[PDB]
Ligand binder design. Structure first.
Ligand SMILES: NC(=O)c1ccc[n+]([C@@H]2O[C@H](COP(=O)([O-])OP(=O)(O)OC[C@H]3O[C@@H](n4cnc5c(N)ncnc54)[C@H](O)[C@@H]3O)[C@@H](O)[C@H]2O)c1
Ligand SMILES: NC(=O)c1ccc[n+]([C@@H]2O[C@H](COP(=O)([O-])OP(=O)(O)OC[C@H]3O[C@@H](n4cnc5c(N)ncnc54)[C@H](O)[C@@H]3O)[C@@H](O)[C@H]2O)c1
Ligand SMILES: [Zn+2]
Ligand SMILES: [Zn+2]
Ligand SMILES: [Zn+2]
Ligand SMILES: [Zn+2]
Lengths: 378, 378
């Protein structure tokens, strides 16, 4: 039995920014009250991992085990945990759903405050310490998930129980970019049939917005990206018009307004660039257009516009995980995937192993790369 | 009888920015196709008039007859005019409602449309000339209204027909500030019973927000003003807590978040100050708070925030004329007033004559002045 015992396993440890990750045998402590220990079978990576690895995350603490997009099988649960048990298939989520805080009970938001005071500084709530160690020294958790590892320990309030027949090498993507994009359309914007939409940035997030908009019945789905090779890829996801800002001297907002005789019904910024966020708002139609910020700006960066943009009827909003409540709705997303109503496989452009994680990180710089999934068994 | 004749009457003319208005006899030409000539009995003044008069307006065309808040009686109508006739009591409105343009037909906005190509450059649609002259030299219209005169000519699409028993020296306020503040609450924000609200600026607009919020069922109605004398006044309008930012070292948004354990459900900026607009966004509650810009900022000034504010669930909006459709809904607001369901009288702190209009502009500096109503007979 591994039950109640320390597990020794392989993990990719980031000891310093910009140094290659080291595959180590780490000690993974057993789960304390309200905790779940998960055997991670597959983990994806994205630029959020890379940002922290690169030393730019104000919350980054080293050494740490990165990774926040994964799916595995519960090994063991700690005292009091009732919603999952050993053997359940699960997606650990970086956004919790406690069901008991003011945010959860509001019915007006998917934010949840419950464990953020621990997860944001790389530790567990129960004892304000890590469950990972190498040579008896602690290793920080990351985003409450730490999925670059054969085993992790997470808060129960962050574990989504999923269909046990769903392929774990695909549904790992339902912990980040795909829900955020779909949900930006379906939950945050509530895009109606016939709407015209602009999507700025055609990475995994922007491609999931395109899928969500297409599914919701949008008409024009105009993609905007500085890399023109993104368009052929994006077509399959629903983008049906394309503009590269580099092909126009006029501000991209002015180009989209011209193209649409006044602007779009909804826009989505899927990059993290405050200038492009402004452009996204300014290309929305007067009277009713709504812009949704999905990208995450760097610390200290600000969005600006002239207030007449809002006085004359444009609405500025943003989204966190697409407005989805993680424990309740990630499983539903998995169901939709199993019934072929959402795409997941099409976002997975590469498959490597945890051992090749440094090689995976090198792929993030390639324009053709959407998500890369890692098999943690080797 | 005066129908078909040029009328000679008193008007206050602005010959250039920043000089006292000249009370002159002027010639008011008869109405042409789709026009209405109105005997104005009472007109108020506001910031919008002063913005142009002071030379701050970029549209600023001189010489002109300023004024946009008024009530009167129709003296005659032009060819094709069917919805009003001689003897009707009316409020001319700077916001048109044609019912026939893409915006009027949309059902998603109040922002017509139909006569701006003329009103925006001080003339009439039918012949692209002005109806006003002095000594044979044209005087431009303003805002499609020009109500600082005993008679004016306005496009039919801008004329609200109202209860002929309503007092014209009170309902002259129902073409600008009072509707904007009420509707910002009822139409733009859709404030729910039990909401907590912050209102930045307790002039006529902010007090109208207070009354809208109180009527909608709001709980905490927190007023913020740099003039603490404004509070005692605001209480009757519904304001039930007050903060003067000068009494705090911390930025006002931080004070308001501390006072409300996280922020308000809705905020309203009722000043026109881009820094305050930002504060009003940043004092909204995480996950759901919405801020509505009601204030009109100087041309060129930008609003800014960090986009994490919107990603974590605050929504930034703004309003034009409180979302009310002028011709349809101004008569409804008059009905509400006559049935004692909305305040109007209480916003009128001073009464002067058109002869005294320069003293009225002086009162716009007066902390004690909300609206000043001018009797055009002298
Ligand atoms: N709000 C949330 O809850 C949430 C969750 C996940 C990811 N995100 C954010 O979404 C963003 C997108 O992530 P991703 O994994 O899709 O990123 P990505 O790197 O795969 O894609 C970004 C795309 O933007 C394009 N781009 C860059 N600069 C551009 C510009 N100036 N104009 C137009 N296109 C431009 C790139 O060519 C690329 O196609 C990131 O900021 C990420 O942090 C947000
Ligand atoms: N959106 C629209 O359709 C529309 C229509 C009418 C008026 N407006 C605008 O609404 C705004 C207010 O008009 P009003 O007639 O009520 O103005 P007002 O001058 O009577 O009132 C402004 C109030 O704000 C206060 N104030 C000034 N600076 C402040 C600060 N830094 N912090 C807190 N309080 C401050 C003043 O003390 C005053 O009490 C104006 O900008 C006007 O242009 C908008
Ligand atoms: Zn991710
Ligand atoms: Zn919670
Ligand atoms: Zn006004
Ligand atoms: Zn119209």
């Amino acid at each position: 039995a591994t039950q109640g015992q320390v597990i020794t396993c392989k993990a990719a440890v980031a000891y310093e920014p910009n140094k290659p990750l080291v595959i180590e045998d780490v000690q993974v402590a057993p789960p304390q009250a309200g905790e779940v220990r998960i055997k991670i079978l597959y983990t994806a990576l994205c630029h959020t991992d890379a940002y922290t690895w690169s030393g730019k995350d104000p919350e980054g603490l080293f050494p740490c085990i990165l990774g926040h997009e994964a799916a595995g099988i519960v090994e063991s649960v700690g005292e009091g945990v009732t919603e999952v048990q050993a053997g359940d298939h699960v997606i650990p989520c970086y956004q919790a759903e406690c069901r008991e805080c003011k945010f959860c009970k509001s019915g007006k938001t998917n934010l949840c405050g419950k464990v953020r005071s621990a997860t944001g500084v790389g530790i567990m709530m129960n004892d304000r310490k890590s469950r990972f160690s190498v040579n008896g020294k602690p290793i920080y958790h990351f985003m409450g998930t730490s999925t670059f590892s054969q085993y992790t320990v997470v808060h129960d309030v962050s574990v989504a129980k999923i269909d046990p027949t769903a392929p774990l090498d695909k549904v790992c993507l339902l912990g980040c970019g795909v829900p955020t994009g779909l949900g930006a359309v379906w939950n945050t914007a509530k895009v109606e049939p016939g709407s015209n939409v602009a999507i700025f940035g055609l990475g995994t997030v922007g491609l999931a917005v395109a899928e969500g908009a297409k599914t919701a019945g949008a008409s024009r789905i105009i993609g905007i990206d500085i890399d023109s090779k993104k368009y052929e890829t994006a077509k399959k996801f629903g983008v049906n018009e394309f503009v590269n800002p580099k092909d126009h001297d006029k501000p991209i907002q002015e180009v989209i307004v011209d193209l649409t005789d006044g602007g779009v019904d909804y826009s989505f910024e899927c990059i993290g660039n405050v200038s492009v966020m402004r452009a996204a708002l300014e290309c929305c139609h007067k009277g009713w257009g709504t812009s949704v910020i999905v990208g995450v700006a760097a610390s200290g960066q600000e969005i600006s516009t002239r207030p007449f943009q809002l006085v004359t009827g444009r609405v500025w909003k943003g989204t966190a995980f697409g407005g989805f409540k993680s424990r309740t709705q990630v499983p539903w997303l998995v169901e939709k995937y199993m019934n072929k109503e959402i795409k997941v496989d099409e976002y997975i452009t590469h498959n490597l192993t945890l051992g090749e994680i440094n090689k995976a990180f090198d792929l993030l710089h390639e324009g053709t790369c959407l998500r890369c999934v890692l098999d943690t068994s080797k």
